[PDB]
A paper describes a structure:
[name] is a high-affinity prokaryotic K+ uptake system that forms a functional chimera between a channel-like subunit ([name]) and a P-type ATPase ([name]). The heterotetrametric [name] complex comprises four subunits, namely the channel-like [name], a member of the superfamily of K+ transporters (SKT), the P-type ATPase [name], the lipid-like stabilizer [name], and [name], whose function is still unknown. At high K+ levels, [name] needs to be inhibited to prevent excessive K+ accumulation to the point of toxicity. This is achieved by a phosphorylation of the serine residue in the TGES162 motif in the A domain of the pump subunit [name] (KdpBS162-P).
To further investigate the role of the tight state in the conformational cycle of [name], we prepared a cryo-EM sample of KdpFABS162-P/D307NC under nucleotide-free conditions. This mutant is catalytically inactive and thus restricted to E1 states preceding phosphorylation in the P domain. We have termed this state the E1 apo open state, as the N and P domains are far apart to provide access to the nucleotide-binding site. The high degree of flexibility of the N domain in these open states could facilitate nucleotide binding at the start of the Post-Albers cycle. The second state, featuring one structure resolved globally at 3.4 Å and represented by 19% of the initial particle set, shows a compact conformation of the cytosolic domains with the N and A domains in close contact, providing no space for a nucleotide to bind. The presence of a similar tight conformation in both the E1P and the E1 apo states of KdpBS162-P shows that, while the inhibitory KdpBS162 phosphorylation appears to be a prerequisite, the observed close association of the N and A domains can occur before or after the binding and cleavage of ATP. EPR analysis of KdpFABS162-P/D307NC in the absence of nucleotide resulted in distances that resemble the E1 apo tight (34%) and the E1 apo open (66%) states. This corroborates the cryo-EM results that both tight and open states are adopted in the same sample at nucleotide-free conditions. Notably, the E1 apo tight state likely has no major physiological relevance, as in the presence of ATP, it would progress through the catalytic cycle up to the point of inhibition.
Author numbering:
A (entry chain D): 1 to 27
B (entry chain B): 7 to 682
C (entry chain C): 1 to 190
D (entry chain A): 1 to 557
Write the structure that this text describes.
């Protein structure tokens, strides 16, 4: 919707991608 | 290790502020908390400025408590590594190292120029004379004497480093009050196990075990599902009315993520490794640390005698007429050649009863014979009265060979010792008996029910020994092991290890001599012996500083305690989320769905206070569980199903009941103190 | 992978087995063993059909045993659009519909009990259901008796003749086949 | 009504176990690559004719075989539905489906979900419902049983690489398990009154004087495999409550038995193949306790149904709205829980017209992963991920290494088990979130408020968890809904099949240690309760907020 919704969606997607990468590559 | 020293805690408060994202990147479970803390801090700053509507104080308190949570997790982790570093450099014994004199030839009298640590290498020779700290590890060559090995053991008891014998290896710097003993530095300083342990604790090189990274994978999966559940509440509640504010979503997220185990996992690992370091065992890898508690078959091996039994407590009562000072001197001189923990504790208790300590062994040039399991009777040979000690039957055979008899007083004293419960040991000057000493049992019955508990865990304890088979059966009967193997060749030992590993069972082995190196190299767990060889020390992966082969069961206990602590805290952090829901969900939806107040199982004050109390509890539970993570769980040896039942009854019910009480008490405190 | 001929071969064989011969075998076995059950269970009166014994029909006459409401599309009992109204208990539209049905049934049944059965006011799962409980069927026998000049015991005997029960009472409910009961009423009147 | 429900559950479970134990004994032979008695001799010549040579292949080739068969079925079903009016057996001359609906009901039928956003009595033709729907109802079920066969073989094989032949397994399943049972079930349905014919639609002059059109078609042959394969793809719009499709309470009982048949049979076969039946007993107890609790809760919440019915002038407050008459409230509640927990899209009672609390428990069983007698094979390898998590947690409790059935479970299997656990609730939450922002997703609402959000959440979880049961009030024939749900079904089946086969390929490489006293007993009431607590806690901690904003809000409103 608005800019807040867009930046929330991108923040949640970035955190989800970071956690997926962490699960795939267990450092 | 009082677990809260003033200097350690203040340096911890100094060093916990290193919470930059470059160091929080490697932990995703708490990088989520850090990102949420920064996001809510920006939101609170925006509300204070006036860019968005709000109250700018509830969000600020939530931000401060989330920062307090991440600071508490870093507090726990850095406390564990600080305690590990303190223990490591406390057991470090290089210290001054400002006097390392050289020797030209291996003979008394050479160029003794004292230069401080002038690049000592493997194969060099140095000298110490009445007070000089040992420069580097090696083997004594000629004229060895009594040294005060404390920097590697923790006891101020005198231990002789006999030249050309079992007591050849010297470990680290120590105190020497006699003189004229030559050693040969067979290794360079830096590749020793002490230096490797120092280099491993001095830095961030603390690479996690495979089971640890599996646990982090589970924590990351829980983090992903909780992040999705909290992030999808904005459309779900935004359609039904006003949208749920972002700070409540972030606070519910942080209350949902397994923050307890996610911040205490590194603390658990480092605390367990430091606990095993405090058990006089130095390891080289956390994988080996966990594999120690992961064994199924246990090998208790030494090239010489075995005599599995501690019997540390003693009484030292002749009731004869000869004074206890000379009794203790006799026992100390007889047991100075004994590397067993029984003789070591006899010397320790004699020292702490009367200050004998150094005895000037080179005064009479005594020849030393070690303990023999085939005779169970040994001593030294100062003069014609060859003073000796041993078991009752062996000393009776000795005194009948020498032409003597047992006095009725010492017979009654042996009877009293046997009735009270001990193994009667008596020292004899070689021509006339002095008095029996007691070896009081360790805790309840000692090694026998400890092995019974280990077999109740389904852990095989195979007796390995090098003496004859007839005495090995008696030693096995005294210890409590199910089966034995005597005079085993190294090829047969390696074949037995490969046969036990062929079915998949992990193996743990003790080893001293250089002939045990091929077995210890391919063994899953290889605890070396300081009474053995440096070659075997480097071949193995763990070093025992007490020179006791019975410490393997304690190492197994520590390795199991680490895993039990990990699982218990993981299940506690998972089960806390039920009360987190019962505190947050009826209060998060206050203006969207006003009918969602019947789910408030706890009569909480306000929606603005329920989430705040939940976040306060989520912050405080890490501090309240720091002592649990440092100590480990209460280890009760039982059947595996019984341990599962006990751990469930404690920790699952704790996760299902303790957060209810904690959140209720925190909300009650907030209401009676007027913060909310 | 590199194996594609076995994949296509077994897919063609499994298609030709699961569709085709298996429906053909089931069809020939059904039409050989159970006619009037494999064909639609139609009730026939000679070169015509009055509907099946299973689907159910929209009955609104005064002398007919009324069934459950249906709430299908474009017609009350329309087999071309199955599935009843998916109104929740929280929907006020369902409350309005139930209130209207209760008012209509109470107006149409002056000499019966004011407690309307749930069967006659709640729409069925499918809109096609010629089944009501015998209590709901006996709830309507004063109106049918008044509109058809029949006896209460005669209507009860007709219902009990046209009521079907399961093998055990707890895997289902006793039901009354509405369509053939009304057809039996028509034949009894004629 | 308290004793009738208990007797119903008791006799259902008793007849189910009695019927399913011999089927488990039969399925153990197919798992152990042993031909069935009498099927040999013709099996070899059939394999020689079809071109399969019993090539023992690994997990990658097995997965590629299953996936290639599924995409071939998807392509042929999509083309069959697009070019429907060119095909024969179309007495009503129905036009070809639109692209969105055709793709939706092609991916839906291939991915063993059988979501139906249409009305089959006036949407699809006889040839379509004969050779594209029944074929995929057989093939998706056979694919699920083949994947669970691979998983059980991986658990039971010692230090190998191969995992059997996928084509041989599929042929064995759908020729000696599915068809011989579905034939008897279809013939019994025909005898009870279900339809099996190819006549055109019969024009009916009713008693009153109006006209209605009765739809015919091969209904019973489709319905037999629809029940047996836990499929739920109905011939008509009323998915399993049509009198031409579920005519008798005896037919309903056979339907429930067929729905739980192959899950229970596969649990028994898993117990038998290891040689230790206690593992299958453990799995069956862990499923059955949750199943009985859920059935009791739903029965009580439906008996204490509509509160407005008692005060609005009716006789009792029982919830009979959206329920049939030949099947009672208790029977409809039991069927709802059976189909919804078993990943079967069959509905007798319209789940949208349920009580909020009585419809929350089916959707809870749906959102915890189809593990309580779930799916057809798919429930069994969805159950062995919670089992792997349980043995991991219990191993950390007891201090030993995490292992199950004598096989060590390492970091790679933790990665794959975590991903397979993650994939379906992620799909439910993101799909519901996407549907609750778009106006095209929020315009399909029928009931207003928390029940409408429950409708959207139920539809998304039905697509993602491969169930097919629907809150039928949602108008999901929109292109956005069709594409979103088709994507959800596709990736929610093939993001569980792939990690489970990777787990199988990891498990074949290891060998089982001997069960010493140090290994915890995986059977027993302790581990049954631990596994139940694990699956309930994992499925609850990820969906309590959604349930609170949906059916709990509707119940407390
Ligand atoms: C209101 C709630 C109150 C709770 C009610 C209490 C209900 C408890 C369960 C009832 C009976 C279950 C078994 C009891 C023995 C336990 C031992 C065991 O492990 O079971 C194996 C049991 C005994 O076999 P075994 O001695 O191990 O034989 C070894 C063989 O080598 C290997 O062969 P096998 O193991 O495959 O089977 C061998 C079989 C030979 O093979 C066969 O004949 C075919 C397979 C077995 C058929 C039997 C079916 C039994 C299972 C379901 C029965 C209905 C329960 C539903 C009621 C629950 C509440 C609604 O011969 C037997 O020994 C079978 C006898 C089993 C019991 C007899 C039938 C029970 C009558 C109905 C009871 C109804 C409740 C009455 C209580 C009233 C209280 C208010 O066999 C089986 O039942 C096979 C199935 C495998 C286990 C699954 C069982 C699931 C349980 C269903 C209910 C779960 C919910 C209960 C709690 C409610 C929620 C909190
Ligand atoms: C929240 C955490 C808090 C923890 C609380 C509990 C934790 C420890 C449990 C111990 C409590 C002791 C209670 C008294 C014992 C008497 C009952 C009995 O015989 O069962 C022995 C059993 C211990 O088994 P065991 O020591 O391995 O000995 C095995 C022998 O076969 C035992 O047999 P036996 O030699 O004693 O006598 C033979 C015979 C005769 O037994 C007797 O002499 C006594 C008669 C009773 C019949 C036994 C079957 C029923 C037992 C359980 C009853 C319901 C308990 C539910 C309440 C939960 C809290 C206690 O019993 C049988 O084995 C025949 C049954 C055939 C086996 C088939 C499996 C049946 C399953 C039935 C339902 C199981 C649980 C239901 C769901 C619970 C979900 C929470 O104790 C139980 O009652 C276990 C059930 C309690 C639940 C366990 C786990 C709870 C935590 C959930 C997980 C949450 C954590 C978070 C997840 C992870 C993160 C995601
Ligand atoms: K998980
Ligand atoms: K927590
Ligand atoms: K399905
Ligand atoms: K459906
Ligand atoms: K799942
Ligand atoms: K699935
Ligand atoms: K889940």
């Amino acid at each position: 919707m608005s800019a807040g919704v867009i930046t929330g969606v991108l923040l949640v997607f970035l955190l989800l991608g970071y956690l997926v990468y962490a699960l795939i590559n267990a450092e | 290790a009082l677990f809260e020293p003033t200097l350690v805690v203040q340096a911890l408060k100094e060093a916990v502020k290193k919470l930059n994202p470059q160091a929080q990147w490697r932990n995703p479970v708490m990088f989520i908390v850090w990102i949420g803390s920064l996001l809510t801090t920006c939101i609170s700053i925006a509300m204070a400025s006036g860019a968005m509507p709000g109250n700018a104080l509830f969000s600020a308190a939530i931000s401060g408590w989330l920062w307090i949570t991440v600071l508490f997790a870093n507090f726990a982790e850095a406390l564990a590594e600080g305690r590990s570093k303190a223990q490591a450099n406390s057991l470090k014994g290089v210290k001054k190292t400002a006097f390392a004199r050289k020797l030209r030839e291996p003979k008394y009298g050479a160029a003794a120029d004292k230069v401080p640590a002038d690049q000592l290498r493997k194969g060099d020779i140095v000298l110490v004379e009445a007070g000089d700290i040992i420069p580097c590890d090696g083997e004594v060559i000629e004229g060895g004497a009594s040294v005060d090995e404390s920097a590697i053991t923790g006891e101020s008891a005198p231990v002789i480093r006999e030249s050309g014998g079992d007591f050849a290896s010297v470990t680290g710097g120590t105190r020497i009050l006699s003189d004229w003993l030559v050693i040969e530095c067979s290794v360079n300083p830096g590749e020793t196990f002490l230096d490797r342990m120092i280099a491993m604790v001095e830095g961030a090189q603390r690479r996690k075990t495979p089971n640890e990274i599996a646990l982090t994978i589970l924590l990351i999966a829980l983090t992903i599902v909780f992040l999705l559940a909290t992030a999808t509440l904005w459309p779900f509640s935004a359609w039904g009315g006003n949208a749920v504010s972002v700070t409540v979503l972030v606070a519910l997220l942080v209350c949902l993520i397994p923050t307890t185990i996610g911040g205490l996992l590194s603390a658990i690992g480092v605390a367990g490794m430091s606990r095993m370091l405090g058990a006089n065992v130095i390891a080289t890898s956390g994988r080996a640390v966990e594999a120690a508690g992961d064994v199924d078959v246990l090998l208790l091996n030494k090239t010489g005698t075995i005599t599995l039994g501690n019997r540390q407590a003693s009484e030292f009562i002749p009731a004869q007429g000869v004074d206890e000072k000379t009794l203790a001197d006799a026992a100390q001189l007889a047991s100075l050649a004994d590397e067993t923990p029984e003789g070591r504790s006899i010397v320790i208790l004699a020292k702490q009863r009367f200050n004998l300590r150094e005895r000037d062994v080179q005064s009479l040039h005594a020849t030393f014979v070690p303990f023999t399991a085939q005779s169970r009777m040994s001593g030294i040979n100062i003069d014609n009265r060859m003073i000796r000690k041993g078991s009752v039957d062996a000393i009776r055979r000795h005194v009948e060979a020498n032409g003597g008899h047992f006095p009725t007083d010492v017979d009654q004293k042996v009877d009293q010792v046997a009735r009270q419960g001990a193994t009667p040991l008596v020292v004899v000057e070689g021509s006339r008996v002095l008095g029996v000493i007691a070896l009081k049992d360790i805790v309840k019955g000692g090694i026998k029910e400890r092995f019974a508990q280990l077999r109740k865990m389904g852990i095989k304890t195979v007796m390995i020994t090098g003496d004859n088979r007839l005495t090995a059966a008696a030693i096995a009967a005294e210890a409590g092991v199910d089966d034995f193997l005597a005079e085993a060749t190294p090829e047969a030992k390696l074949a037995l290890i490969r046969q036990y590993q062929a079915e998949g069972r992990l193996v743990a082995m003790t080893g001293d001599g250089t002939n045990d190196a091929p077995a210890l190299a391919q063994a899953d767990v290889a605890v070396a012996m300081n009474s053995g060889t440096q070659a075997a020390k480097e071949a193995g992966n763990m070093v025992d500083l007490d020179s006791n082969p019975t410490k393997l069961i304690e190492v197994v206990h520590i390795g199991k305690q680490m895993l039990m602590t990990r699982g218990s805290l993981t299940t506690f952090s998972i089960a806390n989320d039920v009360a987190k829901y019962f505190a947050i969900i009826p209060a998060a939806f206050a203006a969207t769905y006003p009918q969602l107040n019947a789910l408030n199982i706890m009569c909480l004050h306000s929606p603005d206070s329920a989430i705040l109390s939940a976040v306060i509890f989520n912050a405080l539970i890490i501090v309240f569980l720091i002592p649990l993570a440092l100590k480990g769980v209460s280890y009760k040896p039982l059947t595996a199903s019984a341990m599962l039942r006990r751990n469930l009854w404690i920790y699952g019910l704790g996760g299902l009941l303790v957060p209810f009480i904690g959140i209720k008490v925190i909300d009650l405190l907030l209401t009676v103190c007027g913060l909310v | 992978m590199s194996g594609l001929r076995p994949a296509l071969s077994t897919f063609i064989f499994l298609l030709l087995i699961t569709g085709g011969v298996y429906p053909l075998l089931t069809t020939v076995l059904g039409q050989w063993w159970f006619p009037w059950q494999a064909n639609g269970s139609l009730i026939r009166e000679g070169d015509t059909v009055r509907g099946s014994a299973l689907i159910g029909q929209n009955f609104t006459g005064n002398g007919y045993f009324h069934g459950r409401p249906s709430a299908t599309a474009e017609m009350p009992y329309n087999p071309q659009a199955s599935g009843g109204s998916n109104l929740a208990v929280s929907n006020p539209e369902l409350d309005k519909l139930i209130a209207a049905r209760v008012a209509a049934l109470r107006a149409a049944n002056p000499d019966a009990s004011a407690s309307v059965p749930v069967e006659l006011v709640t729409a069925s799962a499918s809109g096609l259901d010629n089944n009501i409980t015998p209590q709901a069927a006996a709830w309507q026998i004063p109106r049918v008796a008044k509109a058809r000049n029949l006896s209460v015991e005669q209507l009860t005997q007709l219902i009990a003749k046209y009521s079907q029960q399961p093998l055990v009472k707890y895997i289902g409910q006793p039901v009354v086949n509405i369509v053939e009961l009304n057809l039996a009423l028509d034949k009894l009147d004629e | 009504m308290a004793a009738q429900g208990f007797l119903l559950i008791a006799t259902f479970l008793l007849v189910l176990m009695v019927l399913a134990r011999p089927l488990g004994s039969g399925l153990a032979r197919l798992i152990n690559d042993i031909p069935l008695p009498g099927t040999t001799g013709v099996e070899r010549v059939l394999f020689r004719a079809l071109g399969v040579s019993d090539r023992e292949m690994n997990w990658k080739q097995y997965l590629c075989a299953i996936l290639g068969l599924n995409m071939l079925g998807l392509a042929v079903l999509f083309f069959m539905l697009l070019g429907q009016h060119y095909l024969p057996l179309n007495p009503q001359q129905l036009p070809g489906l639109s692209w969105d609906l055709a793709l939706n009901t092609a991916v839906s039928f291939v991915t063993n979900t059988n979501w139906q956003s249409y009305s089959g009595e006036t949407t699809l033709s006889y040839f379509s419902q004969m050779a594209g729907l029944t074929v995929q109802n057989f093939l998706s079920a056979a694919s699920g049983i083949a994947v669970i066969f691979a998983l059980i073989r991986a658990f039971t094989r010692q230090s190998m690489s191969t995992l059997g032949n996928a084509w041989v397994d599929l042929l064995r399943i759908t020729l000696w398990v599915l068809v011989p049972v579905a034939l008897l079930i279809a013939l019994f349905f025909i005898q009870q009154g279900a339809l099996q014919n190819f006549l055109p639609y019969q024009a009916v002059n009713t008693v009153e004087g109006a006209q209605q059109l009765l739809p015919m078609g091969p209904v019973a042959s489709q319905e037999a495999i629809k029940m047996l394969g836990t499929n739920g793809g109905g011939f008509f719009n009323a998915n399993s409550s049509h009198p031409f499709e579920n005519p008798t309470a005896l037919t309903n009982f056979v339907q429930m038995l067929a729905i739980f048949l192959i899950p229970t049979a596969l649990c028994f076969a898993f117990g038998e193949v290891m040689g230790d039946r206690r593992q299958g007993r453990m799995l069956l107890w862990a499923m059955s306790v949750i199943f009985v609790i859920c059935v009791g809760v739903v029965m009580w919440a439906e008996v204490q149904g509509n509160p407005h019915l008692l005060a609005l002038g009716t006789d009792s407050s029982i919830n009979m709205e959206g329920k049939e008459s030949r099947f009672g409230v208790l029977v409809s509640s039991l069927f709802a829980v059976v189909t919804t927990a078993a990943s079967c899209g069959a509905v007798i009672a319209m789940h949208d017209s349920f009580t909020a609390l009585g419809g929350m428990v089916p959707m809870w069983l749906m959102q915890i992963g189809e593990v309580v007698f779930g799916g057809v094979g798919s429930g069994l390898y969805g159950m062995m991920l919670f089992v792997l998590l349980a043995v991991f947690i219990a191993g950390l409790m007891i201090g030993r290494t995490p292992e199950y059935l004598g096989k060590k479970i390492d970091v790679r299997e933790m990665k794959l088990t975590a991903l397979a656990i993650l994939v379906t609730p992620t799909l439910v939450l993101m799909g519901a979130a996407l549907a609750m922002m778009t106006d095209a997703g929020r315009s399909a609402m029928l009931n207003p408020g928390p029940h409408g959000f429950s409708e959207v959440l139920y539809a998304v979880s039905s697509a993602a968890n491969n169930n097919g049961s629907a809150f039928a009030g949602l108008s999901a024939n929109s292109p956005f809904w069709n594409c979103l749900l088709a994507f959800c079904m596709f990736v929610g089946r093939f993001g569980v099949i792939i990690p489970v086969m990777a787990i199988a390929g990891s498990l074949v490489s290891k060998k089982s240690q001997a069960a010493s006293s140090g290994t915890l007993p995986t059977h027993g009431p302790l581990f049954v309760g631990l596994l139940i607590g694990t699956v309930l806690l994992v499925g609850a901690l990820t969906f309590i907020p959604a349930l609170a904003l949906g059916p709990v809000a509707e119940y407390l409103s």
